[PDB]
Symmetry: C3
Subunit: 106 residues, 3 copies
């Protein structure tokens, strides 16, 4: 899977979170999101393929995934305890970050 596939996986699991009812579905979708984000952090996005891996652009690209993962973790902690609608509301803020990172580097 490339970076685009990871972005698509993030978006699909965000859809699953939006269409979720219990906390187990939310937990599974958030674990999938974390795995996809960690896989995409290793990749080079299409916009930065003309840059060296040592460029500051790639460093900022990798650091943005830290914010992404912290938001994923906030949602996952809201889901681990019991609050499902709160986890969905937190993932609503997560979709903004996901799609902004997607459209910024594609």
């Amino acid at each position: 899977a490339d970076w685009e596939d990871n972005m698509e996986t993030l978006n699909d699991n965000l859809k699953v979170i939006e269409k979720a009812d219990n906390a187990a579905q939310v937990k599974d979708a958030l674990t999938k999101m974390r795995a996809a984000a960690l896989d995409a952090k290793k990749a080079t996005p299409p916009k930065l393929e003309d840059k060296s891996p040592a460029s500051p652009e790639m460093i900022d690209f990798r650091v943005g995934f830290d914010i992404l993962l912290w938001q994923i973790h906030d949602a996952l902690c809201l889901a681990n305890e019991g609050k499902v609608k709160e986890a969905q509301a937190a993932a609503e803020q997560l979709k903004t970050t996901v799609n902004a990172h997607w459209q910024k580097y594609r």
Copy 2:
């Protein structure tokens, strides 16, 4: 703004956690600390301004701020469980790491 202002934000929110009264204030201060630590991880400290962004020194700098981020996460997870005193005790460890990073990279 810059790395020094991020360190000042970290110190101010550490003092806020020290003077905190409930879990909401601790969580807010720790979220602000997480944001400031990410911003500082995106920055270049004064001592390392003569090093390339991909030098081992800068990599170790970003890893040290990752350590700070994980300690902030532990404090925030302790705060989300309603343990305000334990969250503040964990934030006492944050103060040592912040002071060490300040003295090491200023």
Copy 3:
């Protein structure tokens, strides 16, 4: 410590978690694992010494340690809630990821 010693610390604390009785031991071993993974993010495997510190191989190395850190976080959050057995089960899968990362870069 270098990469091999950090991996050894990870494996020792995994064995401690496997043969743990209470939650405090699991939490202490997981904190040691977190410290070891964070420190190993600054290390270089002997077969990648000639490579660039920001080369895609080293990027995959550090982000694999990020994956380890997030799994450690899941185990530690399970242990904080008293779920010692779920934490041990998550540590079982964590050992698989540790062994995969070991076989990949050794």
